[PDB]
């Protein structure tokens, strides 16, 4: 009875966890902005930089949204 | 100019932005864009155009 009900906090405690990765993919992209606009000749590489700065954070996000549900589903 | 004497002919370069805002050898200059570049370039044609006139 409670083993299901301890699966609806859990599974909203380990989604929390993406809160750092709303923090990270703005740091990424206020830091495209400004860098872009110091030295506007590089928008091709700091836009290449950006994507690899909101892959690499937004992954770590994800794997809370993934263990969220690996307890919510799986077990 | 060098003495009452004698003089001698001389020719001082002069830098445009695009020359001194591509020598990686000011990589190690700070806070430098590429407008505070053009404002340092503009001046300093004043100066070796005034220490110019001067000799």
């Given at each position: 009875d409670i083993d299901t009900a301890a699966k609806f906090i859990g599974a909203g405690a380990a989604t929390v966890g993406v809160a750092g990765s709303g923090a990270g993919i703005g740091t990424v992209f206020g830091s495209l902005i400004i860098?872009?606009?110091r030295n506007?000749?590089?928008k091709q590489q700091l836009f290449s930089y950006a994507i690899l700065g909101f892959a690499l954070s937004e992954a770590m996000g994800l794997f809370c949204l993934m263990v969220a549900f690996l307890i919510l589903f799986a077990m | 100019?060098?003495?009452v004497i004698s003089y001698k002919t001389e020719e001082k370069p002069i830098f445009s932005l695009n020359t001194v805002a591509s020598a990686d050898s000011m990589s190690i200059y700070d806070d430098i864009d590429a407008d505070v570049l053009q404002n340092y370039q503009?001046?300093?044609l004043a100066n070796i155009?005034?220490?110019s006139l001067k000799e």
């Open positions: 860098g872009y606009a506007p000749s590089l | 100019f060098r003495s503009e001046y300093n155009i005034y220490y």
